[PDB]
Amino acid sequence: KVYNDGYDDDNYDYIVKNGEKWMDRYEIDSLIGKGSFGQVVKAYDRVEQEWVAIKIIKNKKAFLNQAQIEVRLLELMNKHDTEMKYYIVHLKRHFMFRNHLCLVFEMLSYNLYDLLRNTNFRGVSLNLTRKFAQQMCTALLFLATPELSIIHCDLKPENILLCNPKRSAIKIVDFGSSCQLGQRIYQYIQSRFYRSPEVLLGMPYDLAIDMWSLGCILVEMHTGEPLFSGANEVDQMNKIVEVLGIPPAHILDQAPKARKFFEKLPDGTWNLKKTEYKPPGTRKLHNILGVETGGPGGRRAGESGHTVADYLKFKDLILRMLDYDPKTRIQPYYALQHSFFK
Numbered sequence: 018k019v020y021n022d023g024y025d026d027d028n029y030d031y032i033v034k035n036g037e038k039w040m041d042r043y044e045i046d047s048l049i050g051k052g053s054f055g056q057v058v059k060a061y062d063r064v065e066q067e068w069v070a071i072k073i074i075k076n077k078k079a080f081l082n083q084a085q086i087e088v089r090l091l092e093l094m095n096k097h098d099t100e101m102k103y104y105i106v107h108l109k110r111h112f113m114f115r116n117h118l119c120l121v122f123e124m125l126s127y128n129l130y131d132l133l134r135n136t137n138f139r140g141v142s143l144n145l146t147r148k149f150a151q152q153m154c155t156a157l158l159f160l161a162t163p164e165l166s167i168i169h170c171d172l173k174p175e176n177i178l179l180c181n182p183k184r185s186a187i188k189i190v191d192f193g194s195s196c197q198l199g200q201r202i203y204q205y206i207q208s209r210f211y212r213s214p215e216v217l218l219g220m221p222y223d224l225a226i227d228m229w230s231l232g233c234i235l236v237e238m239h240t241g242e243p244l245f246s247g248a249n250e251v252d253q254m255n256k257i258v259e260v261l262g263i264p265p266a267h268i269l270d271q272a273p274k275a276r277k278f279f280e281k282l283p284d285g286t287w288n289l290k291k292t293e294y295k296p297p298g299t300r301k302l303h304n305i306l307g308v309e310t311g312g313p314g315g316r317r318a319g320e321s322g323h324t325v326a327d328y329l330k331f332k333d334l335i336l337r338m339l340d341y342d343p344k345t346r347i348q349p350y351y352a353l354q355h356s357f358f359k
């Protein structure tokens with residue numbers, strides 16, 4: 018009948034209520050998020066005199082244990098002095114309240130998915146995309162700090178938020194699915210649209226999977242539509258092949274899941290299995306971006322900073338972010354050194 022003395026519901030969530038006062042400090046405003054982990058509420062901190070985002074975890078061992086990993090990752094990031102850490106959302110403090118673990122975060126603004134939505138999925142300029150690009154590449158340089166070596170593992174537009182409605186400052190949220198580099202435990206990771214080929218193929222993976230996702234995201238922000246919108250993994254991989262062609266043979270010769278998407282012919286070469294799709298490597302990024310044709314759908318023709326040279330610098334960077342070889346894929350340091358950010 019009742020759960021946690023009438024404070025919880027069926028799904029172990031805390032029943033949030035407008036204007037509730039927690040610990041004579043936090044004044045609860047309204048619900049602003051929901052997921053497996055639980056809920057995210059907007060609250061006014063009366064001590065610090067500032068709005069905060071309180072992530073209320075479910076009263077369940079499984080979720081609690083996951084939140085404790087996240088706290089440990091966020092606190093470990095807060096230990097470092099570097100100025101790159103401010104592209105990661107800031108854990109202010111955490112506490113237990115009515116058997117729920119509550120993480121207090123700074124109050125950020127709209128996520129980049131709502132930004133796509135606000136454009137009716139037509140995208141944002143190459144100028145704004147440069148600014149997001151440069152900030153994200155710095156955030157990934159930060160996670161790549163040797164002592165951190167953190168893979169965020171679920172990079173997507175909705176997991177990137179603006180600090181302010183009126184600014185192009187962004188921060189990465191949701192480190193729930195994140196872990197530090199190590200021996201492979203998990204194989205079903207990343208949101209499918211932004212899932213890297215090594216994961217799809219089930220090969221060993223490292224921090225390079227976040228860069229693949231970054232490149233998918235940067236093309237989405239500018240064109241307005243996902244670059245690879247697979248309905249399932251077979252569809253996801255075919256859609257990648259459309260743009261980048263067949264993965265090299267030495268890669269497919271290693272992959273546990275090669276034969277889920279491909280077939281090794283008697284000559285030794287690898288080809289797609291049938292299920293539709295353009296032949297391998299004929300949906301050129303050159304044309305998806307509209308390099309020489311005034312951008313995506315010709316909507317950027319005549320707009321400052323959207324010249325043919327500018328598009329060729331954007332294109333080149335993205336192709337280095339979508340390298341099939343994670344060994345050869347562009348690292349965050351060399352990315353910040355790219356002609357596109359001049």
Ligand SMILES: CC(=O)/N=c1/[nH]c2ccc(C#N)cc2s1
Binds near residue numbers: 126191
């Ligand atoms: C939804 C909104 O307007 N602002 C938000 N800001 C934040 C900040 C951190 C988290 C987490 N975890 C969630 C949100 S939602």
